[PDB]
Every structure is written in structure tokens, then in C-alpha cells.
């Protein structure tokens, strides 16, 4: 009670928010790449420097951001993805909170450059000062967008001390891209570190062969033991690959990716049902290797938990669904 | 790009926030009880109805909220706990985001009643409408505060469908109070459900016997096997109780509470070090039973992660510290 209840200034408020949204360089990559995806990009190019502690540049060939909305994109609680509660309950995009860019900009030197198809001119924007005032100025850029994040945590020292080695931080970034690339086979994703190419996942044309990308992302080892899955029942449909439990090594066990309507996730309900389907067919219980995609009525699952967490309205039903699907294929 | 980037109205913005802050009735209880603690309360009384889906009332004998700050308490990004980045890096209170009440009020009928020692008059406040306009009116109330949360999720149907049985929801509430009561032995906490008293933990006077409350919260079973711990090394000090691994049952295994400077938490680093100290002394590896308190330089740990998660600057050091402390006592 000694200090009055007082509104937190823009920058400070965003930095506090950044504490949750910006865990490490990998977090920034995730947020930006997901924005490119929402913007309908077909190709995303990612350049990293020193594990991302020095630089993170992500360019996409998405639809871009209109000049008069650049500042809004750097603003808090402002989005183009939902306008009401209905939109949220049945969301189509990955984003909707309208907080990511604002948060990131408050704890780094973030530059937003973009041009829409209707604009002849490209523009660049960035916020500054305790009030996060935005400067918009001329720039050069093709249809699409480029986010440039420099000196992450430069103005938040307590956090900068927690940054691990360049090697460790880049690895988390590599892992993040790995999870996103598996979610969208139709999107070309290139990742580079310190001026050198680390990877590039070619987009798979309509109906093209996926085994190619799967192997490129997860490795040939997984690709060989990969058992495809096709299991449906109304709104519930399970797809993907499950490695033969009998031929699953701990190295392959590193591949445990699950998705709910394209949204990457790590839910215990699912990991359990799978390990159950394997333990029940196989002899011993162990860490299975898989890449599964669950399609379900968006109204039967909560995506606003805070991101890899989700909540299923019919917990039991879903769990048994996945269990059967995997169990079935394992036999 | 079809829909413009647009600011989310106050109520909607808060409801989206509520998706993360308000997981279930237990979340509301946690936020409110922690506010009472920050306000210096010595006694907190909690009344629940129908698992909290119908009513949640929390009254404290804290310092209260000044009339002219009631609306600010229901506002977003407004707090009395930090005013800058320094304050955050070495925080003293549990709160600091200034978002909890605003979020909760947007997804329930929340009434805030309070009176400070300097005021002869008590006042009541609550927000309404898409803009969250606040109404302040006369009320009766002793020094302190009472939060009243009714019909949780009444205006967010998609979420209301996820509410479990009254029994299940109250249980999470009981568990939450359990964790908070262990964090503060000096605070009397009474919990009631549907007009009937479920529990009441008496505050322990200065230096009074703690075994009494420990047993009342964790049960006599744990109290008997409880092995006290006193282990320090500079800023690092470990205290609490660890149940004899050899006499630990799965029922006792339900008691795994760890705290960093009074802030409840569930960090794997610690749970691992403990289970390691037990596995290494004991024969088999298992689920230990414990109530440990780690005191550490606030600058060596990050509390703004999003709450039971924390991040230690010197991960390895801390882990070995706890391991030794427990290991030592187990012998
Ligand atoms: N690469 C991009 N291409 C096009 N629009 C983008 C891009 N990145 C961000 N935006 C715009 O900025 C707004 C989002 O910023 P963000 O802070 O990520 O919030 P959110 O995605 O939850 O709405 C989006 O709603 C969209 O309108
Ligand atoms: N029970 C209470 N007694 C006194 N002050 C309170 C109480 N509950 C809330 N407040 C005030 O309301 C503001 C907090 O609301 P909240 O949304 O919980 O945010 P935070 O605790 O993170 O600041 C506090 O900063 C404090 O000034
Ligand atoms: Mg986004
Ligand atoms: Mg609070």
C-alpha cells in the first residue's frame, strides 16, 4: 500500500510481458515464423547470428503489412486474426493475442520491413522509448515481410545473463524450426547460422511425396521405421508416422511431435495414449518415436492456454481415439 | 490481411488474457489469496460454492485498497508492486503483472470491496461492458478486502463447457490452498465449501511449533516420517521436511512441494536432485515425499516465466546444493 497502484508505462509493460512470450532466441524465431505462416507465406528464410543473441532475421513471401498498419503491428493487444469471442473459439490462424511483436520489440532492436501487393513503396518501422513510439520510413522490399531482431535482451540485463552458449541457443532454434517444418510440408523453410546454411526444407507440391521432407527433417533412420497412419471417426482424424516400437532407439525417441489442427503441441494425454498403444502391443513400455497429426472440431479443444498446451473437451474420448489408431497400425 | 490489424476492446482483450491466467476456479483462488498475502494479511477466509463455478469469496485482514485506487486495481497493467525493471529483478511480492483482477473480472461477476485504516468509509467496485467501465459505490467493511467472484465463465461459454464436476474443481482449490498454507505458516487460512467448513490452518506464532500445521496440511502420516532439513551455503539455504524414502508410500508421494523464496513452484531441476539424493541413498528410485524451501539471491533466479515455473542462473550449482542437503539428512 505504500506505493500507489499505477499503470506500467508501455515499454516496461511489454518487457514484463516479454518475460513469458520471449523465453530465449528460439521463442522469437517461433513467433516470427508463425506470423509468416499466418500471412500465407510459401517460403521463409531464417538467418541467425551467434545463437540469435546477436541477430535473428526472418523474411517471408507472405502478403505483407500495409503502411498504415505497421505501427499497429508493433502495438499491444492489436491483431488482424480475431475481432470477437466467436473468432477465438474457432480460430483459423496460429496467432490472435496481438502481443508477440510488441513484447519482442521492447527487449531488442526490432525492425519491421514490409510491402503489400497494392503498394509500390516498401516501408520500415520500429518502436522506441518508454512509450514505444513508432517511426515509419521508406525502405526497399518485395511483396512480403522481414523482421530483424538485434541484440536480444540488451535492455534487460537480468535476462541476458541466462542466455546459454551460442551452440545451445541455436540448437533450440533448430529444434523449433524442425517442429514448424513438420507442421507445414507445403512451406519452404531455409535456416542459416553465422552466414552458413544449416538446412533447407523444400515445400512439397500438391500431393507430392512427403517421405522426402520427413526424412530431411527427422533423418533417414526415422524414415525407415516410419509407419504411416490413417485413422478417422467423424471430426477426429489421425495421420502421420509411428516408428516400430521394437526398432525404436533413444535417438529416434527424440522425435515425438504431435499436432492439433496444425498447431504444434506437447500434451501428456496424447503421449500417454501412444506409449500405451506401444506398450500394449510391444512388450516393455518405452519412449516411442512419432510424428502425428490430430484433426478435431476446433470447438472441442482450447488453444488459448499458453505455446504447446491444449485442452480437450472430451479428454477420454480423444485419448482412446489415438490409442486405437496407433494400436491398430502397430498390428 | 483481409481484416485490418485492430486493437482488441478492453473486455475482449482481458478475456483473451483470462485464457492463460484463469485456468479454472482454483486459478482464481490462487490469484486472490496471493493478493491478500501481498497486502500483508494475517488471516484469509475462503468461501466456495459448487466447486467455485457458482461462487468464490475471499476476505482478508490486509491493508486494503484506497477508494481512489479501486478502479486502478481492476485495470490492466496497473500494479503497486513494481514501478521499474529493478523492482522486478529483485521482487518482494508475489504479484507484479497487474493483470489478474482485470482478467478475472472480464470472465465473471467480480465485486471488489475494501477499506483502508485511514478511511472511515468502505467502498465497493466492479467493471462492466466492452470497455470495462468501473462503478464505485458505498459499502460496509472492516480494514481489509473481500473479493467476490460469481458465475465464472458466464460470458465465455466455450470455456464453461470445460468445467469438471464440483467435486473435482473444489479438490483443485483444496490443493491450491494446501500449497499456499505451507508457504506461509504465519497466516491463518480458513476454507469452506457450500456453507460447510472444510479446513482451517491456524497461523503459527513467532517461533511456535510448526509440526502442528504441517500435520494439519499434509496429514499425520507425513508428519511421522518427516525428516527436518537445515542446509546452508551463503545465499543458498534449504529447509523443510523430507519423508524417509524407505517408508514413503504413493499416498505420501502426493506431497511434493518446493518453494523458492516463499514462491510455490514445481521445477524438474529440484524434483530430480531430490529423487537422486533418495535413489542414491535408498536402493530403488521412486517418488519421494517432501516440503522444501530454497532461499536464494533473487537475482540468481527468474520468477517471470509463467505460476510455478522458475529459472536458475546457475542451474548446476543449485541442483547439487539440494541433492547434498537431502542426501546429507537421509544419512
Ligand atoms: N510476417 C508478417 N506478415 C504479415 N502480417 C504480419 C506479419 N507479422 C505480423 N503481422 C501482423 O501483425 C499482427 C500480429 O503481431 P503479433 O504481435 O504477432 O500478434 P498476433 O499474431 O497474435 O495477432 C498480425 O495480427 C498481423 O496482422
Ligand atoms: N486483497 C488485496 N488487498 C490489497 N490490495 C490488493 C488486493 N488485491 C489486489 N490489490 C491491489 O490490486 C493490485 C493488483 O491486482 P492484480 O491484478 O492482482 O495484480 P498484481 O498483484 O500482479 O499487481 C495490486 O497491485 C494491489 O495494489
Ligand atoms: Mg503472432
Ligand atoms: Mg496479484
Amino acid at each position: 500500500h505504500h506505493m500507489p497502484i499505477q499503470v506500467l508505462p508501455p515499454q516496461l509493460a511489454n518487457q514484463i510481458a516479454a518475460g513469458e512470450v520471449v523465453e530465449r532466441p528460439a521463442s522469437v524465431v517461433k513467433e516470427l515464423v508463425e506470423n509468416s505462416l499466418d500471412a500465407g507465406a510459401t517460403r521463409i528464410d531464417i538467418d541467425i547470428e551467434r545463437g540469435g543473441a546477436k541477430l535473428i532475421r526472418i523474411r517471408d513471401n507472405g502478403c505483407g503489412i500495409k503502411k498504415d498498419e505497421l505501427a499497429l503491428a508493433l502495438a499491444r493487444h492489436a491483431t488482424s486474426k480475431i475481432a470477437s469471442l466467436d473468432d477465438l473459439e474457432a480460430i483459423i490462424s496460429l496467432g490472435f493475442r496481438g502481443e508477440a511483436l510488441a513484447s519482442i520489440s521492447s527487449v531488442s532492436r526490432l525492425t519491421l520491413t514490409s510491402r503489400t501487393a497494392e503498394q509500390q513503396e516498401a516501408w520500415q518501422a520500429y518502436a522506441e522509448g518508454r512509450d514505444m513510439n513508432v517511426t515509419v520510413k521508406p525502405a526497399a522490399h518485395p511483396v512480403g515481410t522481414t523482421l530483424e531482431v538485434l541484440d536480444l535482451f540488451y535492455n534487460t540485463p537480468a535476462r541476458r545473463k541466462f542466455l546459454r552458449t551460442e551452440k545451445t541457443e541455436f540448437n533450440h532454434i533448430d529444434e523449433i524450426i524442425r517442429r514448424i517444418a513438420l507442421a507445414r510440408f507445403d512451406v519452404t523453410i531455409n535456416l542459416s547460422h553465422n552466414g552458413k546454411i544449416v538446412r533447407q526444407y523444400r515445400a512439397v507440391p500438391e500431393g507430392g511425396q512427403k517421405e522426402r521432407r520427413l526424412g530431411a527433417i527427422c533423418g533417414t533412420a526415422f524414415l525407415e521405421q516410419a509407419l504411416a497412419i490413417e485413422w478417422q471417426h467423424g471430426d477426429l482424424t489421425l495421420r502421420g508416422w509411428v516408428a516400430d516400437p521394437n526398432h525404436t532407439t533413444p535417438a529416434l525417441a527424440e522425435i515425438q511431435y504431435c499436432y492439433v489442427n496444425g498447431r504444434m503441441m506437447r500434451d501428456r494425454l496424447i503421449n500417454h495414449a501412444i506409449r500405451q498403444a506401444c506398450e500394449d502391443k510391444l512388450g516393455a513400455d518405452q519412449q516411442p518415436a512419432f510424428v502425428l497429426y490430430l484433426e478435431i472440431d476446433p470447438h472441442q479443444v482450447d488453444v488459448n492456454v499458453h505455446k504447446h498446451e491444449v485442452r480437450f473437451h472430451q479428454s477420454r474420448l480423444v485419448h482412446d481415439f489415438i490409442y486405437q489408431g496407433v494400436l491398430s497400425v502397430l498390428q
Side-chain angles (χ1 to χ4, degrees), chain A residues 2-306 308-331:
Chain A
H2 177 275
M3 303 165 63
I5 295 179
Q6 182 174 55
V7 171
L8 296 164
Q11 186 169 54
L12 180 55
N14 283 304
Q15 304 182 311
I16 289 175
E20 304 173 66
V21 47
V22 189
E23 182 186 311
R24 65 204 319 168
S27 298
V28 173
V29 175
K30 170 186 165 297
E31 293 304 323
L32 307 196
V33 172
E34 300 192 323
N35 282 329
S36 302
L37 290 180
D38 293 333
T42 287
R43 172 174 173 173
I44 306 179
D45 291 291
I46 309 170
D47 298 306
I48 304 299
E49 271 171 49
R50 297 177 177 174
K54 195 291 180 184
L55 178 164
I56 294 179
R57 178 177 299 145
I58 298 174
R59 177 180 179 178
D60 65 64
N61 68 328
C63 66
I65 300 180
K66 204 189 307 180
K67 182 188 181 186
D68 69 316
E69 300 196 315
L70 290 170
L72 284 167
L74 299 177
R76 221 187 174 179
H77 316 309
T79 180
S80 63
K81 302 165 182 173
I82 58 174
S84 71
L85 205 51
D86 293 68
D87 305 319
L88 193 265
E89 315 180 314
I91 189 166
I92 307 170
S93 59
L94 295 169
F96 64 78
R97 298 200 182 77
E99 289 293 68
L101 293 189
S103 289
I104 297 172
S105 68
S106 72
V107 297
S108 67
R109 287 299 187 183
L110 178 162
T111 294
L112 167 60
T113 307
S114 190
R115 186 167 76 72
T116 60
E118 301 66 43
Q119 294 176 182
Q120 286 180 297
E121 308 297 347
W123 301 84
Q124 159 192 296
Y126 54 81
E128 289 173 292
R130 293 188 177 184
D131 300 69
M132 301 289 297
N133 296 307
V134 181
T135 295
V136 174
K137 73 179 73 170
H141 201 286
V143 172
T145 304
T146 289
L147 269 297
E148 194 191 308
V149 182
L150 287 52
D151 310 315
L152 197 259
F153 296 153
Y154 82 103
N155 60 355
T156 57
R159 297 183 57 52
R160 193 166 61 273
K161 312 303 183 63
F162 288 80
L163 288 176
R164 301 310 192 309
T165 59
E166 173 191 59
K167 187 175 182 176
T168 303
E169 293 307 333
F170 179 72
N171 279 36
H172 285 79
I173 293 179
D174 188 54
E175 176 63 11
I176 281 301
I177 297 304
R178 189 98 53 53
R179 300 177 186 175
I180 299 175
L182 290 173
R184 295 294 299 284
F185 282 67
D186 62 306
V187 181
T188 298
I189 299 179
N190 301 308
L191 173 64
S192 297
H193 191 186
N194 303 310
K196 186 169 184 174
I197 304 176
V198 174
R199 49 196 59 186
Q200 40 203 179
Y201 308 119
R202 286 179 183 291
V204 177
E206 323 186 321
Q209 195 68 62
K210 295 184 176 182
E211 277 52 51
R212 317 171 180 179
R213 167 173 293 211
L214 181 60
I217 299 176
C218 305
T220 62
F222 178 74
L223 180 52
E224 297 184 62
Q225 298 301 305
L227 300 176
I229 296 186
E230 248 190 61
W231 183 274
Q232 177 181 57
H233 181 303
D235 268 297
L236 293 184
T237 67
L238 184 65
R239 294 180 171 181
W241 304 272
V242 179
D244 184 349
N246 185 58
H247 302 301
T248 301
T249 61
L252 289 181
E254 293 175 53
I255 305 177
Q256 302 192 305
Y257 304 108
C258 58
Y259 304 81
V260 169
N261 301 308
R263 185 182 300 280
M264 56 183 177
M265 138 204 58
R266 292 180 175 300
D267 175 353
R268 291 175 294 296
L269 179 70
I270 302 178
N271 289 58
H272 179 65
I274 301 178
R275 194 174 188 181
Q276 179 183 300
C278 293
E279 184 190 305
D280 287 54
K281 199 301 177 180
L282 173 62
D285 186 61
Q286 63 176 60
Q287 296 297 300
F290 63 80
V291 177
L292 297 178
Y293 309 75
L294 174 63
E295 298 302 304
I296 181 177
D297 179 1
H299 299 67
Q300 300 302 303
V301 58
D302 189 308
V303 172
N304 190 192
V305 180
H306 191 208
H308 298 73
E309 305 193 64
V310 297
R311 308 180 185 182
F312 302 78
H313 172 287
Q314 306 186 62
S315 178
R316 297 179 177 178
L317 184 57
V318 181
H319 172 296
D320 176 293
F321 174 68
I322 302 177
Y323 171 64
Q324 297 306 309
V326 178
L327 186 59
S328 176
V329 177
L330 293 176
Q331 308 175 302

